[PDB]
Symmetry: D2
Subunit: 282 residues, 4 copies
């Protein structure tokens, strides 16, 4: 497994052709799992889930999808509420690949996409594993915008190297993870005009009349499947108090909280996260 | 493994000889683990950890100790703050068995004993697994006494079969676990004069000037080992809000919460609890 | 007096519905509507005994018996209760010619106040909500709470002993639960109309319109100032149920009283009256 | 006026310590001590500008510059700060012949108020604590909070731009942060004595007496009524830090203002004044 061997493209229909890039691994395993990455500038499937795709592929058929706006998937200048938009895309990939009811793994932005998908297409979503998820989270104590969200915005307005490192450092508990190479690589991807276009589209979509589609804490009481919520105690993007409504209202919820862990659970607690996910998904 | 094959007795010194009953299993395994049962009338090591001792013994050298006042351990009419009292007893067993630094597993009352032990004898306690633990818990939202605590008290004042079933039913999420046989067996053990004596001793000890020894939420910021907190979402004895100070202040804490689970985690979520414990303890 | 303030009105909620209420302080510039808590034998006058007289020196007070309670109609059928009660209140508003009126609500009535403010937004002003149902969601307390359990137990087995047990976990200071109070509530709760109202309440929970009671989902939409008041020791609607509403209601405030249960306006009556009067004017 | 109310006293805390304070409303029956928040350039008069005059019509007000702030001594060394300040306040109490006095404290000063009430229990009456340090423990917010981070950043790099950034996450309404305010605070914070006080504060955190600042451990011992006041949007000492104290202080109350930050007595000054006056008498 390299970026190239696993790379795949599909074209789906979401008000018109939409190219989705994903990675496929562990082919031949009976049970398929879909991984949905976190947001943040420069984010994509391969780098987000580097500490995991290989391990998970020893147990599952893994499909790690670049959400629209990220990675090598299309970066339209236009789009509605994002989680719903990405969920519609994922629905097209599901139909195309002939996929049935599949468990979903989602980190941060992609966790929100996972939930939106599970709500909109309930027969198609199996068990959920959600790490510092957006969407279903609502920060009952932390004033919004959080520190993490503010630094992301500040990057979006002024896309400098300094603003990106500042953002990345409040993503993780262990700031030694934020190396010069990580910052440089992420900045190179995030700084392209296409990615800047996608950032503009993400910004305008917030003003949309479909905003309620992002407020999934209002809806997850309807989720019938087991759901494993995973949180870094020190998450400064989507803080721990945001887990509470979901834990309370999802009937078959579990919550796991890691001390000394930020927003990036699958990297910062990669060994522990992998065993939980593998056990939880069978 | 039967009650008889695993049964062991030791005499330790806590202001005088104190007979401790415990169960020993999986002899020959390199790493020793001590299990400390929950409170409640009729409670003891074998019945509390019935769904677990066998499984854990496939990986560890298991020592499940009847705390003083419970099981076949001594039921003195007199004793000071309980967790400290039971911890002193456990210290004597540790010294006698030549035990070094050992991980501890504790449910409810015994979780408090585990913590008190880890605080008082810090070099002797390894990783902790704590299920709906007393002591370190402090119910920030739930008015005290909780429902669970009130029904236990009501049994203590009026030790009837009806009061014991009522108590047992708020111990678990799935009330079908509370069968006629369970109630009868527990009532038979709890109703003996010796056990009634131990209940009186437990009651008087609350009035003691050493009460601060029970307030372990004040002290667990000192715990240096990894600690796995495990909670039933629907725990009505030690409710979930009681986990928060410990999660915040123990540097290497983790928390796992099971939906559809009460105070009796190791029974109600026995398969999941066993894999977490085994993985966490190595 | 009970009699001097007593009023009746008949409105349309899927047919005639007779509503009883108490009116006081007429002539005052600002009208305020009071909505009592639930529980057996509850009604406007006895729920708000420590408050109507004080409030009427500042406001035009309308204390309304919600359907199923007091001297208001006790239908044997009805859908989600807070919406049902809100529809009734809406009828009363149009009839009395009210504009935008602040609402005061304890427990059940707090839920009705909120449902009303959501369903008829132009008609509700500032809200004072004491241990309110509806907008509360117990993030930590397992449901049903001990309060709700004892209330249910009475519904199944309506004995004096079971009512007393409910009334006793309603309050921090159990000395407020006098034998006379128990006897007064029990005589009222034990009538066949009242048991019909109780049975009707329980069935409504099974309704397809249940989402209407999940008001924590919707209060981010409230634009008016809202003052939440809670007893730290509330065992019916515990304190953790305040949190979503505090977070999501933009002009929210919260006051918490230590040594206070579910019945705020009684157990902390002087402080409640002063808080309410200032917040409302 | 600043000058008319200004007073100095010298007490013993391991040697002479000069304390500055403001005195008003002399002759009133009940004395009240005010303890300002922290942050660079903070002092009694400017912290409590919207409050001293109003409070002095009801109480005998003593607003004390805590050591390290205002015109009080700024030693380059000192142990855990709230105990240090409390020892100073204790000196002032004996000298002025005070008995049992209610305390009002914002942020840092709230922590000092609490430390004082614990260390000299006979000398403290009712407490009013606004976004207080010391007794707070942020159960959900990762530490250091964004507020504390920007405060630290100023300590390392004391620029106008960094002070403004701190002042701006101190408050909900950023229009309160006027250029003039920034300039006033910065001129005071930038003096070499003040930087010495700032450097001293940071080192004290490394002290062996750190447990003295962990007052959430001890307030279950407070016997007096305590009124906690918080801004919902406090980014220095966030709202989740109120919870242990609310739970464990037996006669506690809590008030939370939506649309309010760390600087409660300014951002919600009319409501704060009224709450304080009623609670204290
Ligand atoms: N709060 S959230 O999970 O939805 C989220 C997280 C990140 Cl890092 C980025 C975006 Cl655009 C959104
Ligand atoms: N709150 S606690 O864990 O300490 C506890 C639980 C039970 Cl079931 C019994 C006793 Cl005596 C004490
Ligand atoms: N949870 S609630 O406020 O809606 C409530 C309280 C009482 Cl005391 C009774 C009823 Cl039926 C409902
Ligand atoms: N967390 S705290 O209240 O103690 C506090 C607040 C401020 Cl603004 C400054 C200082 Cl040094 C300390």
């Amino acid at each position: 497994l390299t970026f190239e061997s696993t790379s795949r493209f599909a074209e789906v229909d979401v008000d018109g052709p939409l190219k989705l890039h994903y990675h496929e691994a562990g082919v031949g395993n009976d049970q398929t799992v879909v991984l949905l990455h976190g947001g943040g500038p420069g984010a994509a499937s391969w780098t987000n889930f580097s500490r995991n795709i290989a391990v998970l592929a020893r147990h599952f058929h893994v499909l790690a999808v670049d959400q629209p706006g990220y990675g090598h998937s299309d970066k339209r200048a236009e789009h509605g509420q994002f989680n719903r938009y990405a969920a519609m895309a994922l629905k097209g990939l599901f139909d195309q690949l002939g996929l049935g009811r599949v468990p979903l793994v989602g980190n941060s932005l992609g966790g929100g996409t996972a939930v939106r998908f599970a709500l909109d297409y309930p027969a198609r979503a199996g068990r959920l594993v959600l790490m510092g998820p957006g969407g279903l989270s609502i920060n009952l104590f932390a004033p919004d915008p959080t520190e993490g969200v503010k630094r992301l915005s500040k990057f979006s307005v002024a896309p400098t190297r300094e603003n990106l490192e500042a953002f990345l450092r409040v993503m993780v508990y262990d700031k030694n993870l934020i190396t010069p190479e990580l910052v440089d690589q992420r900045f190179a991807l995030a700084s392209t005009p296409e990615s800047l276009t996608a950032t503009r589209a993400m910004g305008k979509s917030f003003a949309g009349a479909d905003f309620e589609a992002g407020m999934m804490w209002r809806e997850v009481y309807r989720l019938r499947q087991p759901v494993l919520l995973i949180w870094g105690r020190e998450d400064r993007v989507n803080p721990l108090d945001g887990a509470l409504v979901a834990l309370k209202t999802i009937p078959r919820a579990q919550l796991h909280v890691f001390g000394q862990c930020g927003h990036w659970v699958q990297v910062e607690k990669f060994d522990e996260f992998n065993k939980l996910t593998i056990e939880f998904l069978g």
